[PDB]
Amino acid sequence: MVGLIWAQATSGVIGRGGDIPWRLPEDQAHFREITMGHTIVMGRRTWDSLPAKVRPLPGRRNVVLSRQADFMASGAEVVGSLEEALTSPETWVIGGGQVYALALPYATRCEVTEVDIGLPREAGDALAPVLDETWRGETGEWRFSRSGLRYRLYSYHRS
Template sequence: MAFKRVSLIVAVAENGVIGKDNDLIWYLPRDLKYFKDTTAGHTVIMGRKNWDSIPLKFRPLKGRDNVVITRDKSFRADGATVVHSLNEALETAEKAGDEEPFIIGGGQIYKMALEQNLVDRMHITRVHEKFDGDTFFPQFDEEKWKLVSKEDLDPDHRHKYSFSFCVWDKNNLSQ
């Protein structure tokens, strides 16, 4: 495929949790803005459960081509393209001319993308707290990745937890 890169974006607790009961656990406005700004103008690829977790008033995510992956052949998502595999989702992004589609979750989609070695860059917001959850970000081998940027943010009146914006590139991308 003719991408500059395939990226993923996720917010992860210290213990790997990314969600519970198909919902976000924390509220970090700076992280939501980072997500919006980083994915703006790109294709966002997500699983059906992730699509369902987005409040109706925000679906589809504005300013982005929304692609939903599901095994359910009869599933419809207003304002989004429905596909049945990660490769089909990436082909959809390529046909749309996107040079950097973003995989935005959930846990199963992240796991598939990493296992299939499809991701070139990871935007990981590390929430510096442990949470009870039922959805996790998969472990990855940090030896195969290079941390190219990190910004630490402290708690404040709008953010209960400290967190860090981290960008990881595959080691062979930015030597």
């Protein structure tokens, strides 16, 4: 069971200048609830942006898609290809927009956090992947973050 997890503005932006243009504690805890105990797969840039206190993320099998034979994520399995990383019953892909895209065909779940934020798309922006017709799921009921923005949740089996 490959799945995808990400948080985006309504515009589809998920990353900007290597960081995130917001910070939702609530969504952090959801991210951890769904991934805890499972294998997590990330591209290099994602890994590098992890604050050292949680490189690797605890209780999870950290896997990094790179292609440098010497990249060596301290506390992570470095892997040259995606399907070379999915040996598991539950695997969550955690970005970035690049890794996401390569993973979407093998995926049956996407857990999507939508942040009510006017964030028009700028060149260079990292975007959430585009889910076609086969992806079904509720449109979560809105919520206030203690940060002051609105957010909601989305989920998609398929097949």
